Design a protein around this ligand. Structure first.
Ligand SMILES: Nc1ncnc2c1ncn2[C@@H]1O[C@H](COP(=O)(O)OP(=O)(O)O)[C@@H](O)[C@H]1O
Ligand SMILES: Nc1ncnc2c1ncn2[C@@H]1O[C@H](COP(=O)(O)OP(=O)(O)O)[C@@H](O)[C@H]1O
Lengths: 485, 485, 68, 70
């Protein structure tokens, strides 16, 4: 529970290098025990506009700072995260409910993003191009966009912020962060460290706010003429709303929208491995992530052997309980409406053919705990209105051929992540290239990596985060025609 | 006038490798003489949806074609353009009204884009990234987005299409082109050559339509779920409308929106050169382009000498007349409403201080011809609602300091192109980096180049066309985590 | 019926000394036999405003021409 | 699709023909049930749904189902 570091756990918003409370506040409770965590400032349109101005003014100075200097600050920020990793992780588990171990995993990952972009800052290179004309030279400079509005989800209350903000700052931009009301603390803990690190005032701003204020606040920062860019990770519905906001001022946009995620297991797959991957990919964060494999397409031949091994792994490894409790691998669902969606998806399925192999009802721990569920004999049509239902539920759809498996996977007009196990060299290339998805896992169920491009195709998003391509979402190209020669 | 090549001048739409007429047709007239050029198909929402399907189906096959093959087809298309350059140019002058010489310039430029991207097709490279995990390898593939909706203006009826389409095809995408009603012929002449070149059916589609059908048609193709990308060049107003269209399906977008364009002449500038540049940049296409320097910021010291030399160059070189007429450097304005905007801008200015140095009224040739006008003693506030008034008008605003000149230039929340003449090494870098614009001309007034990145910052656009960055607007990154090692 | 003089029987509008077709056309039929006579340009507000301008500009020169 | 996703079993055909455009593969589905013919009483295409029956009284009862008889 408590015992943290007074400085890391914050309740006020962070604007212009100062902790500022709002007129109102919203409650944040531990999703597992229900305990009150704290009263967080609930910023409104005014606080937002103020935060934007703070960022816009910081930008004009920040863009001037040398890259080697911005790199150094990003690294100091990284080091501070590592030094305080245990507390930072307790905060994640306290508000997201994910197991302490999974929180430790996020903090490292989150830290690695600041570290990674710290290294990118000094590597923004312009070009020198040859043109026919002998009286001129072509130079191409890359410069930061300006101020960016950053809006993140509760899933990875730390990493989701750090992967955008690190790139933003690396390029020379300032940011205004609007964290999820379920998990605002992680965003503010970062702010505390950003000041300890020496990040100049106004570069990193955080404006927490409740569901009520979300619509109004989001509209303010995504509309402000002082904001030139928008970075968002969440549901498609919200994404489209922001894209409309951006459209009025032609703002640069980048986002990731929670799509499905097929997990195709072919006959040539190593079962134990397929299962291990199925385990890791589906039950991490209790199945509450946009990369959590939802539909399992298992081939006839290997089907039965798979489904039986999968379930036996669920019994041997999934221990539902409180995130801080030792030996827990399954935390609670973020809230009630969430539990309602799983139940909904489970019943609708069963009452349409589906066969429950394990789990199936709320866990007898009560509250927001649900039993890890594995249903087989599932069909495609049983995945409607549930394309955005995150929970520890794994529907297994049997398939015959590879053309079929691929046809089903590419069904959705959404494509984020995709997984598949196979021992066929050629099949691996065919499927990997044909899966209209942004990220493909081959014989692996956990593909996280700060040095690789994340994002989706079609309606799953725009742009990419992480890797050598992330910083591009925050730069503008300027062709300079040096003539008169 | 006539005498062209029956095959190059077309009146039907081009869909699926076939010339198809619509239920209705719209007239196209020579903007100079008023002569009837022809009756062009006026496609509606039905023809559009049909063209999209044709493209979507062609895509599934086209994406499969080798890059070396797509490169070869793009080059054959290029060669065909060169072989038919004289006719292709007559067509541009016939519908846009720009001088035959300027049309010859566009055809080469237009051809060079197909040539340039032909070379890019074989150079789309993926990456291999090192990650800590020893049991996995990271691969990054680049694949075409799918079908792209392309909407172009009348200014460069050929080049505007060719710079987007060449990249689109280079990446492996198919396209559906909706040309400007003022200049549809150039788009269809290209289609004729694309079939001669052997471009597979459905890869390049053209759906002409009148003002009436513009709204409906644009909405159809920019909304169709079979279209994954949108490329547009035109006014900001239309751009925002399309961005809203795209927002509903999270479509990839890229566009260029007609901003202003400062032309700052400093005291250290070589007058004759500054003037030569001012001439070329302002009166090319009779001042009807988004890169046409509108406001001239000339420094006190060199002011008077400049304004006097500028005007004397206007008398010695600008000869208003019919584009096909020999010795013509000024064609007509696209239409009546256009002439009305210039007059409007000229009067509003004069009746607010401005002093007319030359020109000022409609040219006594009648119709859509306007006298090249040069007004000095102009002030900033005299540029409202006229930020999108293209015409042979040059308002000269005097300035004192460089901080001032820059402050005024960056005034607009629009930044496309910018120019400035100076002989100060350090001043050149300061201004070039500070001009919040997408392209900067240093001691040069004509910066066109297929191998350099075109586009704008802020509200002037999204993405870039041409150069090594153009093809990026049509690809999607796919991170492939090869695990199980 | 036919056999006239190609030049005398016209289907396009006449503006500014040029024969110009409109986006649409309307049918003209012999009121006695019902036979199709031809498809005539169907000018709209745009063609009209254009014709007015053509006339207004011609006027400024025409008024100058001697009466003789 | 509505059929398959309700029990129907595709014996042949089933998707658009790979000739593209308006060409569809001749399709034969068996294991079809009555209720899978709604809003499709006016869907003309190369599709043949096979509904198994036991008795003649039954066959006739199903055939005369529709309030349409051509
Ligand atoms: N209309 C909206 N405008 C702006 N931000 C919004 C809006 N709706 C939700 N958000 C914000 O988006 C983030 C999460 O997006 P949301 O679509 O609610 O996904 P989820 O609940 O699945 O995490 C949160 O920070 C939330 O406050
Ligand atoms: N509402 C609209 N929807 C789709 N396309 C449009 C719309 N308005 C104009 N266009 C198209 O955009 C192109 C030119 O854009 P426009 O904003 O009219 O610029 P301009 O007239 O300055 O060239 C033309 O091809 C035109 O038909």
């Amino acid at each position: 529970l408590a015992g943290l570091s007074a400085a890391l756990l914050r309740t006020d918003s962070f604007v212009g290098g100062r902790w500022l409370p709002a007129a109102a506040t919203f409650p944040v409770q531990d999703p597992a025990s229900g305990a009150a965590l704290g009263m967080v400032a609930d910023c409104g349109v005014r606080e937002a506009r103020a935060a934007v101005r703070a960022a816009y003014e910081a930008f004009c100075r920040w863009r001037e700072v040398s890259a080697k200097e911005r790199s150094s600050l990003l690294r100091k920020w990284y080091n501070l995260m590592i030094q305080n990793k245990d507390d930072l992780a307790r905060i994640i588990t306290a508000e997201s409910g994910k197991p302490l171990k999974e929180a430790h995993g996020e903090i490292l990952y989150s830290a690695f993003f600041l570290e990674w972009f710290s290294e990118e800052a000094r590597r923004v290179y312009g070009d020198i191009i040859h043109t026919p004309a002998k009286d001129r030279r072509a130079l191409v400079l890359k410069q930061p966009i300006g101020v960016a509005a950053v809006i993140t989800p509760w899933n990875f209350p730390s990493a989701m912020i750090t992967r955008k903000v690190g790139a933003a700052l690396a390029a020379g931009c300032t940011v205004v962060v609007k964290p999820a009301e379920d998990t605002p603390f992680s965003a503010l803990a970062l702010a505390e460290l950003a000041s300890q690190a020496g990040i100049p005032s106004g570069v990193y701003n955080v404006i927490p706010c409740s569901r009520k204020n979300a619509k109004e606040v989001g509209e303010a920062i995504c509309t402000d003429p002082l904001v030139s860019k928008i970075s968002f990770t969440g549901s498609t519905t919200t994404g489209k709303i922001l894209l409309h906001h951006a459209a009025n001022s032609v703002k640069r946009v980048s986002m990731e929208l929670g799509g499905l995620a097929p997990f195709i297991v072919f006959d040539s797959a190593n079962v134990d491995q397929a299962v291990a991957g199925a385990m890791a990919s589906k039950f991490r964060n209790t199945g509450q992530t946009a990369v959590c494999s939802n539909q399992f397409l298992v081939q006839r031949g290997i089907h039965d052997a798979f489904v039986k091994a999968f379930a036996e792994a669920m019994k041997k490894n999934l221990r539902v309980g409180n995130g801080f409790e030792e030996g827990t691998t399954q935390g609670p669902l973020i809230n009630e409406k969430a539990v309602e969606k799983v139940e909904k998806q489970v019943n609708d399925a069963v009452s349409k053919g589906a066969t429950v192999v394990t789990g199936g009802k709320r866990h007898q721990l009560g509250k927001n705990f649900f039993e890890p569920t594995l249903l087989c004999n599932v069909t495609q049509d049983m995945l409607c209105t549930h394309e955005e239902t995150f929970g520890p539920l794994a529907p297994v759809i049997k398939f015959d051929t590879e053309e079929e498996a691929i046809a089903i996977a590419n069904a959705a007009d959404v494509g984020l992540a995709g997984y598949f196990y196979s021992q066929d060299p050629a099949q691996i290339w065919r499927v990997a290239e044909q899966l209209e998805v942004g990220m493909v896992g081959v014989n692996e169920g956990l593909i996280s990596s700060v040095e690789c491009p994340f994002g989706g195709v079609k309606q799953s998003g725009l742009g990419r985060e992480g890797s050598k391509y992330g910083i591009d979402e925050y730069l503008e190209l300027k062709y300079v025609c040096y003539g008169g020669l």
